[PDB]
Ligand binder design. Structure first.
Ligand SMILES: CNc1nc(N2C[C@H]3C(=O)N(C)C(=N)N[C@@]3(c3ccc(C#N)s3)C2)nc(C)c1F
Length: 387
Protein backbone atom coordinates (compact mmCIF):
# COMPACT_ATOMS: atom_id res chain seq x y z
CA UNK A 1 0.00 0.00 0.00
CA UNK A 2 1.53 3.22 1.45
CA UNK A 3 4.63 3.23 3.74
CA UNK A 4 5.23 6.96 4.07
CA UNK A 5 7.69 6.52 7.01
CA UNK A 6 10.02 4.47 4.72
CA UNK A 7 9.67 6.34 1.43
CA UNK A 8 12.83 8.38 0.61
CA UNK A 9 14.94 6.71 3.35
CA UNK A 10 17.95 6.01 1.11
CA UNK A 11 20.86 8.21 0.03
CA UNK A 12 23.80 7.65 -2.27
CA UNK A 13 24.41 6.91 -5.94
CA UNK A 14 25.32 3.92 -8.12
CA UNK A 15 29.12 4.39 -8.04
CA UNK A 16 29.45 4.66 -4.20
CA UNK A 17 26.38 2.66 -3.09
CA UNK A 18 22.94 3.38 -1.60
CA UNK A 19 22.64 3.46 2.17
CA UNK A 20 20.04 3.60 4.94
CA UNK A 21 20.37 4.99 8.47
CA UNK A 22 20.44 2.36 11.22
CA UNK A 23 21.10 2.41 14.94
CA UNK A 24 23.05 -0.16 16.94
CA UNK A 25 23.39 -0.58 20.70
CA UNK A 26 22.03 0.98 23.89
CA UNK A 27 22.00 3.99 23.88
CA UNK A 28 21.56 3.91 20.07
CA UNK A 29 24.63 4.66 17.93
CA UNK A 30 23.60 6.00 14.52
CA UNK A 31 25.43 4.64 11.43
CA UNK A 32 24.80 4.80 7.66
CA UNK A 33 24.66 1.33 6.16
CA UNK A 34 25.09 0.18 2.55
CA UNK A 35 22.08 -1.84 1.30
CA UNK A 36 23.54 -4.99 -0.31
CA UNK A 37 21.28 -7.65 -1.85
CA UNK A 38 24.53 -9.46 -2.96
CA UNK A 39 25.70 -10.56 0.54
CA UNK A 40 24.21 -11.75 3.83
CA UNK A 41 26.18 -10.27 6.74
CA UNK A 42 25.45 -7.17 8.82
CA UNK A 43 28.90 -5.68 9.38
CA UNK A 44 29.94 -2.31 10.68
CA UNK A 45 33.16 -0.35 11.16
CA UNK A 46 34.11 -0.87 14.83
CA UNK A 47 37.59 0.72 14.94
CA UNK A 48 39.10 3.95 13.56
CA UNK A 49 39.76 4.10 9.82
CA UNK A 50 40.90 7.15 7.74
CA UNK A 51 37.61 7.08 5.73
CA UNK A 52 35.25 6.77 8.74
CA UNK A 53 34.14 9.72 10.90
CA UNK A 54 32.11 7.38 13.15
CA UNK A 55 32.11 3.71 14.10
CA UNK A 56 30.40 1.22 16.41
CA UNK A 57 31.78 1.44 19.97
CA UNK A 58 30.90 -1.89 21.62
CA UNK A 59 32.18 -0.77 25.05
CA UNK A 60 29.51 2.00 25.04
CA UNK A 61 26.58 -0.36 24.46
CA UNK A 62 24.97 -1.98 27.51
CA UNK A 63 23.22 -4.53 25.25
CA UNK A 64 26.36 -5.66 23.39
CA UNK A 65 26.98 -9.46 23.59
CA UNK A 66 30.34 -10.90 22.52
CA UNK A 67 30.10 -14.14 20.46
CA UNK A 68 33.90 -14.75 21.02
CA UNK A 69 34.46 -15.56 17.37
CA UNK A 70 36.28 -13.93 14.49
CA UNK A 71 35.12 -13.58 10.91
CA UNK A 72 37.42 -13.11 7.86
CA UNK A 73 35.80 -12.03 4.60
CA UNK A 74 38.13 -11.84 1.57
CA UNK A 75 36.24 -11.10 -1.65
CA UNK A 76 37.37 -10.27 -5.21
CA UNK A 77 37.84 -6.48 -4.88
CA UNK A 78 38.65 -6.24 -1.16
CA UNK A 79 38.39 -7.66 2.34
CA UNK A 80 37.22 -7.11 5.87
CA UNK A 81 37.90 -8.85 9.15
CA UNK A 82 36.02 -8.58 12.38
CA UNK A 83 34.64 -9.87 15.62
CA UNK A 84 31.15 -11.36 15.94
CA UNK A 85 28.63 -10.20 18.50
CA UNK A 86 24.95 -9.34 18.86
CA UNK A 87 23.17 -6.10 19.80
CA UNK A 88 19.83 -4.31 19.53
CA UNK A 89 19.36 -2.78 16.04
CA UNK A 90 16.75 -0.38 14.65
CA UNK A 91 16.04 1.42 11.37
CA UNK A 92 14.83 4.99 12.24
CA UNK A 93 13.03 5.42 8.89
CA UNK A 94 11.83 1.84 8.91
CA UNK A 95 9.43 -0.48 10.71
CA UNK A 96 8.93 0.67 14.24
CA UNK A 97 10.69 -2.36 15.77
CA UNK A 98 14.00 -3.16 17.48
CA UNK A 99 15.61 -6.54 17.04
CA UNK A 100 18.50 -8.48 18.47
CA UNK A 101 20.78 -9.14 15.49
CA UNK A 102 24.21 -10.51 14.67
CA UNK A 103 26.79 -7.80 14.00
CA UNK A 104 30.29 -8.27 12.63
CA UNK A 105 32.40 -5.53 14.21
CA UNK A 106 34.99 -4.69 11.53
CA UNK A 107 38.45 -4.20 13.05
CA UNK A 108 40.62 -4.44 9.86
CA UNK A 109 39.78 -3.92 6.18
CA UNK A 110 41.29 -3.39 2.71
CA UNK A 111 39.52 -1.45 -0.09
CA UNK A 112 36.16 -1.92 1.67
CA UNK A 113 35.42 1.59 3.07
CA UNK A 114 35.09 4.25 0.30
CA UNK A 115 36.42 7.79 0.82
CA UNK A 116 33.39 10.14 0.86
CA UNK A 117 30.66 7.42 0.51
CA UNK A 118 29.06 8.50 3.83
CA UNK A 119 28.48 4.83 4.91
CA UNK A 120 30.09 2.94 7.81
CA UNK A 121 28.81 -0.60 7.38
CA UNK A 122 26.93 -3.04 5.15
CA UNK A 123 23.53 -4.69 5.38
CA UNK A 124 23.62 -8.01 3.55
CA UNK A 125 20.02 -8.82 2.58
CA UNK A 126 20.58 -12.16 0.80
CA UNK A 127 20.16 -15.64 2.37
CA UNK A 128 22.00 -17.52 5.10
CA UNK A 129 23.70 -19.90 2.62
CA UNK A 130 26.28 -17.22 1.73
CA UNK A 131 26.67 -15.75 5.28
CA UNK A 132 30.15 -15.82 6.86
CA UNK A 133 31.69 -17.71 8.62
CA UNK A 134 28.83 -20.09 7.72
CA UNK A 135 25.06 -20.42 7.29
CA UNK A 136 24.49 -20.70 11.08
CA UNK A 137 25.04 -16.89 11.39
CA UNK A 138 21.46 -15.68 11.01
CA UNK A 139 21.26 -12.68 8.58
CA UNK A 140 19.59 -9.45 9.75
CA UNK A 141 16.39 -9.82 7.73
CA UNK A 142 15.86 -13.40 8.99
CA UNK A 143 16.16 -12.06 12.61
CA UNK A 144 13.80 -9.19 11.88
CA UNK A 145 11.10 -11.55 10.50
CA UNK A 146 11.56 -14.13 13.30
CA UNK A 147 11.34 -11.58 16.13
CA UNK A 148 8.56 -9.27 14.82
CA UNK A 149 5.36 -9.32 12.72
CA UNK A 150 7.19 -7.68 9.76
CA UNK A 151 6.18 -9.54 6.56
CA UNK A 152 8.97 -11.55 4.82
CA UNK A 153 9.42 -9.10 1.93
CA UNK A 154 11.24 -5.87 1.15
CA UNK A 155 11.34 -3.63 -1.87
CA UNK A 156 13.92 -1.24 -3.30
CA UNK A 157 13.62 1.90 -5.42
CA UNK A 158 17.19 3.10 -6.21
CA UNK A 159 17.09 6.57 -7.73
CA UNK A 160 19.77 7.70 -10.17
CA UNK A 161 19.82 11.51 -10.47
CA UNK A 162 20.66 11.46 -14.19
CA UNK A 163 23.52 13.92 -13.62
CA UNK A 164 26.53 14.10 -11.25
CA UNK A 165 25.90 15.11 -7.64
CA UNK A 166 28.67 16.98 -5.84
CA UNK A 167 29.79 16.23 -2.21
CA UNK A 168 27.13 18.52 -0.67
CA UNK A 169 24.34 17.62 -3.16
CA UNK A 170 24.70 13.84 -2.61
CA UNK A 171 24.36 14.39 1.16
CA UNK A 172 21.20 16.48 0.67
CA UNK A 173 19.53 14.42 -2.12
CA UNK A 174 17.05 11.54 -1.82
CA UNK A 175 18.62 8.40 -3.26
CA UNK A 176 15.56 6.18 -3.07
CA UNK A 177 13.50 3.96 -0.80
CA UNK A 178 13.84 0.66 1.00
CA UNK A 179 10.35 -0.48 2.07
CA UNK A 180 10.72 -3.12 4.75
CA UNK A 181 7.76 -5.51 4.89
CA UNK A 182 5.79 -4.15 1.99
CA UNK A 183 5.21 -2.62 -1.44
CA UNK A 184 4.60 1.10 -1.83
CA UNK A 185 2.42 1.81 -4.88
CA UNK A 186 3.68 5.44 -5.21
CA UNK A 187 7.16 4.15 -6.24
CA UNK A 188 6.18 2.61 -9.55
CA UNK A 189 3.95 2.93 -12.60
CA UNK A 190 2.17 0.19 -14.49
CA UNK A 191 2.14 -3.45 -13.39
CA UNK A 192 4.53 -5.51 -11.26
CA UNK A 193 5.78 -8.66 -13.06
CA UNK A 194 7.37 -11.48 -11.10
CA UNK A 195 10.22 -13.87 -11.83
CA UNK A 196 10.90 -16.94 -9.61
CA UNK A 197 13.86 -16.91 -7.22
CA UNK A 198 15.63 -19.99 -8.67
CA UNK A 199 17.38 -20.85 -5.41
CA UNK A 200 17.70 -19.00 -2.09
CA UNK A 201 21.38 -18.04 -1.68
CA UNK A 202 21.95 -14.92 -3.79
CA UNK A 203 18.71 -13.54 -5.30
CA UNK A 204 19.19 -15.85 -8.31
CA UNK A 205 16.97 -15.46 -11.43
CA UNK A 206 16.84 -16.86 -14.97
CA UNK A 207 17.21 -14.66 -18.11
CA UNK A 208 15.58 -16.33 -21.16
CA UNK A 209 16.20 -13.80 -24.00
CA UNK A 210 18.22 -10.62 -24.56
CA UNK A 211 17.47 -7.91 -27.15
CA UNK A 212 19.37 -4.79 -28.20
CA UNK A 213 16.84 -2.35 -29.84
CA UNK A 214 14.54 -5.31 -30.42
CA UNK A 215 17.24 -7.40 -32.13
CA UNK A 216 17.68 -10.82 -30.52
CA UNK A 217 21.25 -11.46 -29.29
CA UNK A 218 20.38 -15.09 -30.38
CA UNK A 219 22.69 -16.87 -27.93
CA UNK A 220 21.86 -20.22 -26.25
CA UNK A 221 19.97 -18.90 -23.16
CA UNK A 222 22.23 -20.94 -20.87
CA UNK A 223 24.99 -18.42 -21.78
CA UNK A 224 23.00 -15.58 -20.20
CA UNK A 225 22.99 -17.39 -16.83
CA UNK A 226 26.51 -18.83 -16.89
CA UNK A 227 27.20 -19.56 -14.03
CA UNK A 228 24.31 -17.65 -12.42
CA UNK A 229 22.26 -14.48 -12.82
CA UNK A 230 21.64 -12.39 -9.68
CA UNK A 231 20.00 -9.11 -8.55
CA UNK A 232 22.65 -7.15 -6.60
CA UNK A 233 22.23 -3.63 -5.18
CA UNK A 234 25.91 -3.69 -4.09
CA UNK A 235 27.21 -3.79 -7.74
CA UNK A 236 27.23 -0.58 -9.79
CA UNK A 237 27.12 -2.04 -13.29
CA UNK A 238 25.07 -4.42 -15.37
CA UNK A 239 27.71 -7.22 -15.53
CA UNK A 240 27.44 -9.90 -18.22
CA UNK A 241 29.26 -13.22 -18.74
CA UNK A 242 32.31 -12.75 -21.03
CA UNK A 243 30.73 -14.23 -24.21
CA UNK A 244 27.43 -12.33 -23.64
CA UNK A 245 29.32 -9.08 -22.98
CA UNK A 246 31.29 -9.54 -26.24
CA UNK A 247 28.07 -10.12 -28.24
CA UNK A 248 26.16 -7.29 -26.49
CA UNK A 249 28.93 -4.71 -26.89
CA UNK A 250 29.23 -5.58 -30.63
CA UNK A 251 25.48 -5.00 -30.99
CA UNK A 252 25.48 -1.77 -28.92
CA UNK A 253 28.44 -0.45 -31.01
CA UNK A 254 26.56 -1.33 -34.24
CA UNK A 255 23.39 0.43 -33.06
CA UNK A 256 25.35 3.57 -32.01
CA UNK A 257 27.69 3.47 -35.07
CA UNK A 258 26.90 7.05 -36.18
CA UNK A 259 29.39 8.09 -33.43
CA UNK A 260 32.73 6.30 -32.80
CA UNK A 261 33.85 5.90 -29.19
CA UNK A 262 37.32 4.92 -28.02
CA UNK A 263 38.08 1.37 -26.81
CA UNK A 264 38.59 2.78 -23.26
CA UNK A 265 34.94 3.89 -23.22
CA UNK A 266 33.60 0.39 -24.02
CA UNK A 267 35.91 -1.05 -21.32
CA UNK A 268 34.16 1.21 -18.75
CA UNK A 269 37.45 3.04 -17.99
CA UNK A 270 37.17 6.30 -19.93
CA UNK A 271 34.51 8.95 -19.81
CA UNK A 272 32.77 10.36 -22.93
CA UNK A 273 31.61 14.02 -22.87
CA UNK A 274 29.15 16.12 -24.85
CA UNK A 275 28.35 19.86 -24.81
CA UNK A 276 25.77 20.58 -22.05
CA UNK A 277 22.34 19.18 -22.92
CA UNK A 278 23.44 17.54 -26.20
CA UNK A 279 23.92 13.91 -25.09
CA UNK A 280 22.68 11.90 -28.13
CA UNK A 281 20.53 9.44 -26.18
CA UNK A 282 18.67 8.47 -29.38
CA UNK A 283 21.75 6.91 -31.03
CA UNK A 284 22.10 4.41 -28.16
CA UNK A 285 19.85 1.35 -28.09
CA UNK A 286 17.43 0.15 -25.49
CA UNK A 287 18.31 -3.21 -23.84
CA UNK A 288 15.68 -5.77 -22.93
CA UNK A 289 16.17 -8.72 -20.62
CA UNK A 290 13.41 -11.34 -20.68
CA UNK A 291 12.92 -13.15 -17.41
CA UNK A 292 11.17 -16.43 -16.60
CA UNK A 293 7.57 -15.78 -15.51
CA UNK A 294 5.53 -17.39 -12.74
CA UNK A 295 3.18 -19.14 -15.22
CA UNK A 296 4.44 -22.19 -17.19
CA UNK A 297 5.87 -21.19 -20.64
CA UNK A 298 5.47 -17.47 -19.91
CA UNK A 299 8.15 -14.77 -19.72
CA UNK A 300 8.13 -10.97 -19.42
CA UNK A 301 10.73 -8.34 -20.32
CA UNK A 302 12.38 -5.40 -18.58
CA UNK A 303 13.74 -2.68 -20.88
CA UNK A 304 16.35 -0.11 -19.93
CA UNK A 305 17.54 2.97 -21.69
CA UNK A 306 21.03 4.46 -22.16
CA UNK A 307 19.99 6.86 -19.32
CA UNK A 308 20.39 3.76 -17.08
CA UNK A 309 23.54 2.18 -18.58
CA UNK A 310 25.50 5.45 -19.16
CA UNK A 311 26.53 6.53 -15.64
CA UNK A 312 26.89 10.32 -15.14
CA UNK A 313 30.34 11.42 -13.96
CA UNK A 314 32.00 14.81 -13.48
CA UNK A 315 34.63 15.72 -16.13
CA UNK A 316 33.60 22.01 -17.36
CA UNK A 317 29.90 22.39 -18.24
CA UNK A 318 29.91 19.26 -20.41
CA UNK A 319 27.63 16.29 -19.69
CA UNK A 320 29.92 13.25 -19.16
CA UNK A 321 29.35 9.54 -18.68
CA UNK A 322 31.00 6.17 -18.20
CA UNK A 323 29.67 3.00 -19.89
CA UNK A 324 28.20 0.92 -17.03
CA UNK A 325 28.02 -2.47 -18.69
CA UNK A 326 30.99 -4.71 -18.04
CA UNK A 327 32.28 -8.25 -18.30
CA UNK A 328 31.98 -10.90 -15.58
CA UNK A 329 33.54 -14.35 -14.98
CA UNK A 330 30.93 -15.05 -12.19
CA UNK A 331 27.64 -14.71 -14.10
CA UNK A 332 25.19 -11.92 -14.86
CA UNK A 333 24.83 -9.25 -12.18
CA UNK A 334 21.83 -6.92 -12.39
CA UNK A 335 23.46 -4.06 -10.42
CA UNK A 336 22.41 -0.51 -9.75
CA UNK A 337 22.21 0.04 -13.68
CA UNK A 338 19.22 -2.25 -13.87
CA UNK A 339 17.85 -1.39 -10.48
CA UNK A 340 17.66 2.39 -11.11
CA UNK A 341 15.14 1.74 -13.91
CA UNK A 342 12.78 -0.31 -11.72
CA UNK A 343 11.04 -0.73 -8.46
CA UNK A 344 12.24 -4.20 -7.33
CA UNK A 345 10.23 -6.35 -4.91
CA UNK A 346 12.21 -9.05 -3.05
CA UNK A 347 9.23 -11.28 -2.18
CA UNK A 348 11.01 -13.82 -0.03
CA UNK A 349 7.70 -15.21 1.32
CA UNK A 350 6.58 -16.24 -2.22
CA UNK A 351 10.16 -16.97 -3.54
CA UNK A 352 9.87 -14.37 -6.33
CA UNK A 353 11.28 -11.02 -7.46
CA UNK A 354 8.97 -8.36 -8.89
CA UNK A 355 9.82 -5.59 -11.34
CA UNK A 356 7.86 -2.49 -12.26
CA UNK A 357 8.88 0.74 -14.00
CA UNK A 358 10.32 3.09 -11.38
CA UNK A 359 8.56 6.39 -10.76
CA UNK A 360 12.12 7.92 -10.47
CA UNK A 361 13.81 6.46 -13.57
CA UNK A 362 15.67 8.85 -15.83
CA UNK A 363 14.30 9.09 -19.39
CA UNK A 364 13.67 11.52 -22.21
CA UNK A 365 10.53 12.68 -24.05
CA UNK A 366 10.74 9.90 -26.61
CA UNK A 367 11.48 6.68 -24.71
CA UNK A 368 10.85 5.25 -21.25
CA UNK A 369 11.95 2.15 -19.37
CA UNK A 370 9.37 -0.64 -19.53
CA UNK A 371 8.17 -3.89 -17.92
CA UNK A 372 5.92 -5.82 -20.32
CA UNK A 373 4.39 -9.21 -20.84
CA UNK A 374 3.45 -11.93 -21.23
CA UNK A 375 5.45 -13.67 -23.96
CA UNK A 376 5.30 -17.33 -24.86
CA UNK A 377 8.75 -18.85 -24.10
CA UNK A 378 9.46 -22.58 -24.19
CA UNK A 379 12.00 -24.77 -22.27
CA UNK A 380 12.94 -21.98 -19.82
CA UNK A 381 14.34 -24.46 -17.23
CA UNK A 382 17.05 -25.26 -19.88
CA UNK A 383 18.25 -21.63 -19.50
CA UNK A 384 19.49 -22.31 -15.97
CA UNK A 385 23.09 -23.42 -15.56
CA UNK A 386 24.09 -26.53 -13.52
CA UNK A 387 27.64 -27.52 -12.26
C1 LIG B 1 31.62 -13.66 -1.51
N1 LIG B 1 30.90 -13.70 -0.23
C2 LIG B 1 30.73 -12.43 0.33
N2 LIG B 1 30.74 -11.31 -0.40
C3 LIG B 1 30.58 -10.13 0.22
N3 LIG B 1 30.60 -8.97 -0.57
C4 LIG B 1 31.11 -9.04 -1.93
C5 LIG B 1 31.28 -7.57 -2.25
C6 LIG B 1 31.06 -7.38 -3.72
O1 LIG B 1 31.97 -7.56 -4.52
N4 LIG B 1 29.77 -7.08 -4.11
C7 LIG B 1 29.56 -6.84 -5.53
C8 LIG B 1 28.69 -7.05 -3.27
N5 LIG B 1 27.49 -7.03 -3.76
N6 LIG B 1 28.93 -7.03 -1.93
C9 LIG B 1 30.26 -6.83 -1.37
C10 LIG B 1 30.62 -5.40 -1.19
C11 LIG B 1 31.69 -4.80 -0.56
C12 LIG B 1 31.70 -3.38 -0.69
C13 LIG B 1 30.64 -2.92 -1.44
C14 LIG B 1 30.34 -1.59 -1.82
N7 LIG B 1 30.09 -0.54 -2.23
S1 LIG B 1 29.62 -4.21 -1.93
C15 LIG B 1 30.35 -7.63 -0.09
N8 LIG B 1 30.36 -9.99 1.54
C16 LIG B 1 30.31 -11.12 2.26
C17 LIG B 1 30.05 -10.95 3.73
C18 LIG B 1 30.51 -12.35 1.69
F1 LIG B 1 30.45 -13.48 2.41
Amino acid sequence: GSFVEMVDNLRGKSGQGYYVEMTVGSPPQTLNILVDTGSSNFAVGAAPHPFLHRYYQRQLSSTYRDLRKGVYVPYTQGKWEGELGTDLVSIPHGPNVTVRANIAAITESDKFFINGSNWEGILGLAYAEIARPDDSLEPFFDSLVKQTHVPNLFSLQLCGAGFPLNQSEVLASVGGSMIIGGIDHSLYTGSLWYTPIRREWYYEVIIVRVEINGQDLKMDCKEYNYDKSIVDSGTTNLRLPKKVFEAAVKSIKAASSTEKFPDGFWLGEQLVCWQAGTTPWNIFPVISLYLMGEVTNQSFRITILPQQYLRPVEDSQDDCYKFAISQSSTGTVMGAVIMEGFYVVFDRARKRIGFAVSACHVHDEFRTAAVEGPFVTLDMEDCGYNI
